[PDB]
Design brief:
The protein is of the alpha/beta class and 299 residues long. It has a single domain, classed as NADP-dependent oxidoreductase domain (TIM Barrel, Alpha-Beta Barrel). Helix content is 38%, strand content 13%. It has eleven helices and ten strands. The strands form two sheets. An eight-stranded parallel beta sheet has the order 3-4-5-6-7-8-9-10. Helix 5 links the parallel strand 7 and strand 8. It is globular. Belongs to the aldo/keto reductase family. InterPro entries: AKR, AKR3C2/3, Aldo/ket_reductase_CS, NAD(P)_OxRdtase_dom_sf, NADP_OxRdtase_dom. GO terms for molecular function: oxidoreductase activity, acting on NAD(P)H as acceptor; oxidoreductase activity, acting on the CH-OH group of donors, NAD or NADP as acceptor. Pfam families: Aldo_ket_red (PF00248).
């Protein structure tokens, strides 16, 4: 039984994203399109896809969307305007291009990918957000939000927003519990849903793990529930009220991630994962050059 979050505007979003596209010069990846197609064909329930302008994989997504029999209503498509490194002039141009390449009429969620705008953009945050407000009003973007925004950045948006941002996609894992200072607490208190990218950071840099309380406990829980370590971590993110966004080239891992809601963790277990995580040194996979200076406040 798939679980959903309810956004501030009453819309539902599947509470895990299981297909990501960001996985060399100008090469269409048959391997990627095939895994996305297979996921859409075989994963039960609403398949939440994370796409982004910066990945340059719209053709592969579009081909998969065309060739699957998965109905459009059973797909939740998140897309992201490339603000850090300009590809399009503005959100309206970016989304129009994306819709055509994907062969779809609307995206379910549209995000500003970064608060750090390319110097070559002739558009400011306010103007970009207002474009997202218009895309929301026209129905080209069913829901709108932001990614990697700090509290100060969100406050700038909130000060000028007619339509309040619904989502802030941040890096979040047991080893990075506040991407930037206080972001989690602020977002949750202001009814902005957090998505957590790279939630499995701990299992992509596993060192002497056998000696470490965190990994010992994670193995204990895996054995208790007969679920993977990954499944336990993804479920923990959900139990923290956050929407985990995951990837994989293994269909069985993709299916396992979708199936995390087949079990539950006790309050004690959630708190223990949190606390053992917080006593670990930060691990940061994204926006490294911008946000390393915040590592000291992450835990």
């Amino acid at each position: 039984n798939q679980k959903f979050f309810t956004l501030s505007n009453g819309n539902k979003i599947p509470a895990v994203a299981v297909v990501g596209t960001g996985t060399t010069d100008a090469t269409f990846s048959q391997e990627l399109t095939d895994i996305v197609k297979l996921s859409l064909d075989t994963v039960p329930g609403i398949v939440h896809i994370d796409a982004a302008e910066t990945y340059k994989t719209y053709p592969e997504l579009g081909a998969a969307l065309k060739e699957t029999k998965k109905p459009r209503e059973e797909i939740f498509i998140t897309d992201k305007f490339s603000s850090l490194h300009k590809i399009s002039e503005d959100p309206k141009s970016a989304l129009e291009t994306a819709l055509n390449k994907l062969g779809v009429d609307y995206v379910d969620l549209y995000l500003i990918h970064s608060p750090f705008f390319d110097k070559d953009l002739n558009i400011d945050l306010e103007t970009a957000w207002k474009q997202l407000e218009e895309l929301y009003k026209s129905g080209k973007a069913k829901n709108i939000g932001v990614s990697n925004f700090t509290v100060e950045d969100l406050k700038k948006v909130l000060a000028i927003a007619e339509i309040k941002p619904q989502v802030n996609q941040i890096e979040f894992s047991p080893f990075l519990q506040n991407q930037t200072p206080g972001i989690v607490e602020f977002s949750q208190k202001n009814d902005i849903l957090l998505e957590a990218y790279s939630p499995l950071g701990p299992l992509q840099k596993k060192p002497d793990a056998d000696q470490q309380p965190f990994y010992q406990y994670l193995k204990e829980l895996s054995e208790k529930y007969n679920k993977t370590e990954a499944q336990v971590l993804l479920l923990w993110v959900y139990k923290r009220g956050i929407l985990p966004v995951t990837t994989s080239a293994k269909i069985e891992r993709i299916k396992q991630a979708q199936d995390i809601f087949s079990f539950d963790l006790t309050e004690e277990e959630v708190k223990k994962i949190t606390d053992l995580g917080l006593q670990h040194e930060p691990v940061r996979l994204w926006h490294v050059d911008f946000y390393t200076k915040y590592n000291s406040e992450a835990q």
